[PDB]
Amino acid sequence: AEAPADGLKMENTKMPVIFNHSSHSSYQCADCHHPVDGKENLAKCATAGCHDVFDKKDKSVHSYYKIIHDRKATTVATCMSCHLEAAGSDKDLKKELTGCKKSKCHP
Numbered sequence: 296a297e298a299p300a301d302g303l304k305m306e307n308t309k310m311p312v313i314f315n316h317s318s319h320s321s322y323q324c325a326d327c328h329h330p331v332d333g334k335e336n337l338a339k340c341a342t343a344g345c346h347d348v349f350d351k352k353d354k355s356v357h358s359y360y361k362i363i364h365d366r367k368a369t370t371v372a373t374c375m376s377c378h379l380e381a382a383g384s385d386k387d388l389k390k391e392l393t394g395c396k397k398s399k400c401h402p
């Protein structure tokens with residue numbers, strides 16, 4: 296399958312984020328779109344039954360907050376766990392890629 300155009304709005308919450316596939320083109324699709332039940336899975340992450348729990352305190356597999364923001368990941372990277380690695384030690388990359396506000400995720 297082909298990646299969609301840039302400018303995709305992630306908007307399940309009051310803190311929506313613009314996702315650009317072009318900034319992630321060197322990663323395999325399945326690094327984010329993990330298979331489910333042995334089948335390709337390009338479904339929206341917060342689809343009912345999937346990552347559909349919006350309580351920030353929830354740490355279950357169904358937590359939408361966790362799949363995006365958890366600082367550590369084992370099986371499937373989170374946005375944050377990968378951006379923490381990518382930013383490394385420098386202040387600017389941390390600001391742009393990992394910050395809660397004034398970052399490229401949450402301007």
Ligand code: HEC
Nearest residue numbers: 305306307308310311312349363374375392393394395400
């Ligand atoms: C990109 C790597 C992100 C960084 C860095 C941070 N957040 Fe985030 N956040 C991100 C996404 C993709 C989303 C979902 C967008 C949508 O609307 O679907 C969010 C959303 C939130 C929310 C809203 C959650 C809710 O109300 O259910 C909050 C409160 C939030 N983000 C907080 C937050 C904090 C505290 C961060 C620093 C540790 C932070 N975000 C960084 C992506 C990214």
Ligand code: HEC
Nearest residue numbers: 296297298299305314319322323324326327337339340341
């Ligand atoms: C993580 C770094 C990703 C990589 C690598 C790829 N995609 Fe992606 N994609 C990602 C997110 C966070 C989203 C938004 C999902 C949401 O629920 O908001 C998407 C979206 C898509 C879509 C559209 C889904 C829809 O609107 O129905 C498609 C078709 C898609 N992605 C395909 C795709 C392919 C083929 C990729 C490899 C070339 C690929 N994505 C990489 C995150 C990530």
Ligand code: HEC
Nearest residue numbers: 327328329331338339340342345346356361362371372373
């Ligand atoms: C339902 C059919 C799902 C959709 C759509 C998405 N995910 Fe998922 N995810 C689902 C299950 C049943 C699991 C358990 C373990 C497994 O890998 O099968 C997961 C796991 C993850 C994880 C790791 C655990 C966690 O943090 O909850 C991550 C980081 C994750 N999934 C992210 C993710 C993203 C970014 C998705 C949209 C692009 C997405 N998942 C879709 C079920 C389902």
Ligand code: HEC
Nearest residue numbers: 312313314315318319322326372373374377378381399400
């Ligand atoms: C590694 C496996 C990653 C995962 C998972 C996610 N991102 Fe990412 N992202 C990654 C790198 C190495 C970079 C720098 C490349 C660049 O062009 O700057 C990025 C960049 C972003 C950005 C800034 C650029 C832009 O497109 O505006 C944003 C806003 C961003 N990434 C968001 C984002 C979200 C919401 C993710 C989870 C759904 C996510 N990234 C995952 C590496 C990786």
